[PDB]
Write a protein that holds these residues in place. Structure first.
Motif, short mmCIF file in Angstrom:
data_model
loop_
_atom_site.label_atom_id
_atom_site.label_comp_id
_atom_site.label_asym_id
_atom_site.label_seq_id
_atom_site.Cartn_x
_atom_site.Cartn_y
_atom_site.Cartn_z
N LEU A 183 0.80 -1.19 0.17
CA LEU A 183 0.06 -0.10 -0.20
C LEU A 183 0.91 1.17 0.00
O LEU A 183 1.79 1.29 0.57
N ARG A 184 0.53 2.14 -0.70
CA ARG A 184 1.21 3.57 -0.94
C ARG A 184 0.71 4.64 -0.02
O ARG A 184 -0.69 4.49 0.16
N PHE A 185 1.35 5.67 0.15
CA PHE A 185 0.85 6.83 0.79
C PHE A 185 1.42 8.09 -0.12
O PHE A 185 2.65 8.62 0.51
N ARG A 186 0.76 8.58 -1.20
CA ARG A 186 1.47 9.32 -1.86
C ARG A 186 1.23 10.93 -1.60
O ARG A 186 0.15 11.02 -1.47
N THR A 187 2.50 11.53 -1.63
CA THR A 187 2.53 12.79 -1.48
C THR A 187 3.29 13.29 -2.80
O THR A 187 3.76 12.82 -3.61
N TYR A 188 2.97 14.77 -2.92
CA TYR A 188 3.53 15.45 -4.23
C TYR A 188 4.79 16.32 -3.68
O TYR A 188 4.51 16.91 -2.68
N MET A 189 5.54 16.77 -4.52
CA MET A 189 6.73 17.65 -3.97
C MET A 189 7.16 18.52 -4.99
O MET A 189 6.66 18.50 -6.30
N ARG A 190 7.81 19.72 -4.72
CA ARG A 190 8.29 20.63 -5.56
C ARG A 190 9.15 19.96 -6.44
O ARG A 190 9.81 18.91 -6.18
N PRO A 241 -2.54 0.86 -11.68
CA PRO A 241 -2.62 1.33 -10.42
C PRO A 241 -4.17 1.74 -9.74
O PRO A 241 -4.63 2.78 -10.44
N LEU A 242 -4.60 1.26 -8.84
CA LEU A 242 -5.99 1.48 -8.20
C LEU A 242 -5.91 2.41 -7.28
O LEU A 242 -4.74 2.54 -6.55
N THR A 243 -6.71 3.40 -7.19
CA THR A 243 -6.78 4.62 -6.15
C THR A 243 -7.87 4.57 -5.24
O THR A 243 -8.79 4.22 -5.76
N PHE A 244 -7.71 4.76 -3.84
CA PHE A 244 -8.79 4.65 -3.13
C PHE A 244 -9.04 5.94 -2.52
O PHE A 244 -8.50 7.08 -2.95
N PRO A 245 -10.12 6.20 -1.97
CA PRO A 245 -10.64 7.45 -1.12
C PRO A 245 -9.54 7.59 -0.02
O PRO A 245 -9.19 6.60 0.51
N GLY A 298 6.55 -3.07 9.53
CA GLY A 298 6.26 -1.96 9.45
C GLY A 298 5.72 -1.54 8.12
O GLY A 298 6.00 -0.62 7.46
N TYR A 299 5.00 -2.32 7.39
CA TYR A 299 4.28 -2.05 6.29
C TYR A 299 2.56 -2.73 6.10
O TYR A 299 2.34 -3.15 7.13
N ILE A 300 2.02 -2.13 5.22
CA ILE A 300 0.52 -2.57 4.95
C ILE A 300 0.51 -3.23 3.69
O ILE A 300 0.40 -2.63 2.60
N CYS A 343 5.27 7.09 0.90
CA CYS A 343 5.90 6.31 2.08
C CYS A 343 4.91 5.28 2.52
O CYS A 343 3.83 5.13 2.23
N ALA A 344 5.39 4.30 3.29
CA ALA A 344 4.84 3.14 3.93
C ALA A 344 3.76 3.53 4.91
O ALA A 344 2.66 2.89 4.98
#
Lengths: 516, 135, 504, 122
Positions: free
Chosen positions: C404-411, C480-484, C469-471, C425-426
């Motif tokens: 499972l991912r936890f996607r953020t965006y960066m400059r 890639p499937l995206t979740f709410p 330490g992961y899910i 990140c995890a």
């Protein structure tokens, strides 16, 4: 109770026509010592060493399923106490757990064959004349039945010598299934056993190390770390493959279960696919340097032509291989040096290649005369050119006694290969070809230095991947030093290399494994 | 009681030999230069721990001639077992990190003996200038 | 049924003389079976005889009216009583053996001839009623203590003879079994004690915060959506956001959310006639404590992604009028075949492109990242070119499970690339600073998380949290499937690592 | 009887550990009126409004099949008398008819969850 009763629950010990038999009451006044076995062994049943069998629909009537002889080798306790004492007496009680699916049929017969009966055939006509019991392969409960001790001497010795009342059964009328789809239910059996009212050991002796009822211990080391027995290289993965020839006669990595070597298997891990020899270096105006190697055992002892087809550790494949040799040449300023020779196995149309007689040859494409003084030296390989996993010419072209081919397998059993790759010198492609043994060198050096006592025909193994803790397959190990595994696919099938082969129990040849 | 002091390998064949990912280049001086990144011989990765080097790494000084399988990108040649000249002692000039997993090897070849990168195990072919002291 | 060769075993009559009190139990507990949720299993026609279906030890952890009731008392002593329900119909066959292994025994693999030498029952897979059997308390100390996981009589259940059944095209007839367990007649607790909450019986409860607000763990920017992606590398070895469930901090993970991707150091500014004002930072942990080369690949908070990034640094310039000023620098992280970026040793070289000899002054610095360039989700050079002790890659997933991912965006500075690809990140930092601030005790191998919508209440999936330490999430799709990103994670129980989830 | 008995005939009310509970004997002195419901309702069972459910092999373990709360909405009568009166008391007896084909497996659990328990996950 279960649900339901379209089965047939034989819970009663059927009446066998045989008088009671006195146990350790005929050995008390003639074994000068008091002895008893822990009174908590007499309480619970427990699986024999040889515990398992299978009744598959392919088994015709008359195939002996389990032929187990009365003795201390029928418990894990009574076979582990019987390393101290010298001799036993007395009766025993054997269970028999065969509870096949409710959609089966067919019946077995168990016959308390007496001593002094010629082992061998025991066909389906003379298995009922003994005092027997007939039981259906659907029986739910366990079927107790006794194993008395008919003898003419007071107490038997604890060496396998004596003859005691075997208890053999026989697939009387075949197992045939009834469910409407593409499956026949192989009924697996079990065998639990406990010492009777007055089993007892007699005289207390030191628990010798190399005793007779050591079960088996396979070394607890991953196949990933073991060493191959046909090339000085680690093992890189084990797999099953029906495509390759399923009856080879490799003359390396071939040991029985009880340590007896076969063919040309070395005991080292470094003696593999190499040899020592008295060299004879000369030069001629053609290719150049020519070495007439007179073979000799790698340790230094002189070679002699014997039953084995080559000196211990001689390579048992076919093709051109290079060789490294430490030679002391006469050229000033450069005296000691390792050089590379070349040797071609198999027919060559110029072949005095007699590793059996004690002569082989090597040729280096030298321009001038490589002034090398003859001397004893070993020769370790470095690369193979024309690999062919077949027997080379052990004589010039003549016959030579060697190890029998790896077999025979049941219908649907494939050899389980421990596979490694060897350095290759070729020109076209870049896929280093593969060789494979039946047992890694550690298993050979282990069986050769333990000398177990094989019981019936095979050891049912397993494969416990220690990281997660789940099994991977249920492979059977014949006594001729190969691991047969049931398999049906067409393409190869590779297994991971973290498992720990652990012996499970003795088992006859006819054990139909679990397919993968 | 089974504990494995030092860097002793279990298989009797890992002794005095190491597997590594190769990276060949050709400097115009001594010749070819391979920068082996060390890897445990079974294949699993390496991490700097409390043993001196990967399992089976030799523990005797001296310039060691290895014999290793390689593949070339020339014509008519696809596979070939060649040799190298590795220095094991301090040698007073070497970025050798057997602890960190980087070992140099070289040959004497004026031409560009082009070799493709890969994974190779270096069994020892011959020794020279032997000493029974720790490298 | 319950006819095994074991003498009766005394409890709370052998440890009363040497225990201050002997407390009793709410007598409506002795009349109600309860399940320990690692006591479930599912035989299947493809299981070789010899597997261990359930292996569970005696304790107050087998009965959540005791795992909780054992926060008020000092020690327990006595028996229990368990029962096993096998759910098979009358067309199956194949035995199962339950064995009472004593409490001092080399753990490991028990082949199917070593599980029956114990005291044991054997029972078919056609038994309607539960298979009751007792769990006595074979001990050597008088009464055990509750805050001390010490050894006690274990039950082991082994598939003695494989299952033989038909099965339709779906879904191949697993014979499922469950285990339940209640206190026997003389299971008593010993010494009353003020109830301390952090006793070692506590389901690991996750913070009730929607993943849309939690602070990311590898780049200082809030989470912008979580997704699964079987196409991306399925075994990465990120060095941040890495915390075991039992508290430890793997890799270089910092306990803050502000230490991320930014390092503190002692700066050394000097002018060159080329790039201009270069700087050689000697690293330090941000809080001020000195830094030494240890087991982690870098000081706490160093980035773990290859690519050029600029840093923002306050520089006490000794010019006239411009005393204090925040300026941007330029640092390269990737190998790039020429860079003496050795964080493992404590030296990072960051430069600028300036023509003037602007006279900075050295001193303490903390360098916040400003923008990435040529991002690469791979390790920077923690050493010059050597190796470094780093955290092992995430894994390993069962066949049919994806990270499972936890996607953020960066400059991101670029010239033609417009889509803001960025990092994931995890676990969001609000989980790292939560598993390191509780030190939960870990029961077996993985929690059965559940991502419930906060208002509709309907589930979305059943993610399995591996305590390394992961899910992991069971999945079979191609893209890639995206979740709410507005639900809530909530635990359910522990679960064996061989558990199979519900595909989504 | 049916044919045959490769099924499992639980005809006994299993023993639930819960004391008896007084019904309309705690509301007689505090509801100023005598009332009784037709004594032929107490005689035969009858399907609730919510009567039906299905256990299909796709249903994972943990899916609540039928979560029905005690009240007058559990008969077609008691929910059609309860439009006159204002309030009720007392116990009830619920049957549960699940007689799947003799070629099935799997088990359900029924739990008398008390009042004031937070609805939701369970």
């Amino acid at each position: 109770e279960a649900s339901g009763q379209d089965l047939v629950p034989a819970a009663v010990e059927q009446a066998v026509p045989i008088q009671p038999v006195a146990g350790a009451a005929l050995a008390a006044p003639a074994a000068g010592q008091i002895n008893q076995i822990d009174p908590w062994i007499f309480q619970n049943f427990v699986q024999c060493p040889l515990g398992e069998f299978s009744i598959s629909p392919r088994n015709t009537p008359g195939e002996i399923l389990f032929d187990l002889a009365l003795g201390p080798g029928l418990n894990p306790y009574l076979a582990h106490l019987s390393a101290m004492y010298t001799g036993w007496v007395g009766n025993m009680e054997v269970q028999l757990v065969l509870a096949g699916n409710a959609f089966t049929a067919g019946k077995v017969v168990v016959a308390l064959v007496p001593p002094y009966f010629p082992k061998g055939s025991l066909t389906t006509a003379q298995i009922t004349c003994f005092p027997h019991v007939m039981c259906d392969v659907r029986t739910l409960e366990p079927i107790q039945l006794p194993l008395l001790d008919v003898r003419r001497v007071l107490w038997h010795a604890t060496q396998d010598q004596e003859e005691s009342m075997r208890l053999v059964c026989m697939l009387y009328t075949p197992l045939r299934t009834n469910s409407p789809g593409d499956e026949s239910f192989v009924v697996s059996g079990r065998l639990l056993s406990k010492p009777a009212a007055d089993f007892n050991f007699v005289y207390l002796t030191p628990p010798i190390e190399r005793t007779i009822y050591r079960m088996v211990d396979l070394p607890v080391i991953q196949p990933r770390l073991c060493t191959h027995a046909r090339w000085p290289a680690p093992v890189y993965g084990l797999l099953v493959d029906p495509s390759l020839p399923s009856n080879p006669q490799w003359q390396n990595g071939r040991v029985h279960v009880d340590g007896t070597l076969l063919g040309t298997t070395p005991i080292s891990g470094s003696w593999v696919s190499c040899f020592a020899a008295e060299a004879a270096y000369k030069f001629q105006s053609g290719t150049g340097e020519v070495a007439t190697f007179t073979l000799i055992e790698q340790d230094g002892s002189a070679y002699v032509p014997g039953d084995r087809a080559a000196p211990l550790g001689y390579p048992d494949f076919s093709g051109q291989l290079e060789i490294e040799v430490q030679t002391e040449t006469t050229k000033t300023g450069d005296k000691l040096k390792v050089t590379t020779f070349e040797m071609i196995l198999g027919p060559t149309t110029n072949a005095d290649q007699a590793p059996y007689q004690g002569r082989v040859f090597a040729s280096v494409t030298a321009a001038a005369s490589l002034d090398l003084v003859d001397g004893r030296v070993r020769a370790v390989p470095r690369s193979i050119y024309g690999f062919q996993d077949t027997i080379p010419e052990y004589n010039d072209g003549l016959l030579v006694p060697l190890a029998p081919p790896i077999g025979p397998f049941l219908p649907g059993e494939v050899l389980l290969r421990f596979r490694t790759y060897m350095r290759q010198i070729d020109t076209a492609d870049a896929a280093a070809e593969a060789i494979d043994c039946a047992l890694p060198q550690e298993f050979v050096s282990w069986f050769a230095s333990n000398a177990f006592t094989v019981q019936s025909e095979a050891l049912l193994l397993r494969y416990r991947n220690t990281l997660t803790g789940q099994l991977l397959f249920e492979c059977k190990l014949y006594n001729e030093g190969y691991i047969a595994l049931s398999y049906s696919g067409s393409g190869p099938l590779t297994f991971p290399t973290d498992g720990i082969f652990e012996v499970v129990s003795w088992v006859p040849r006819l054990y139909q494994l679990a397919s993968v």
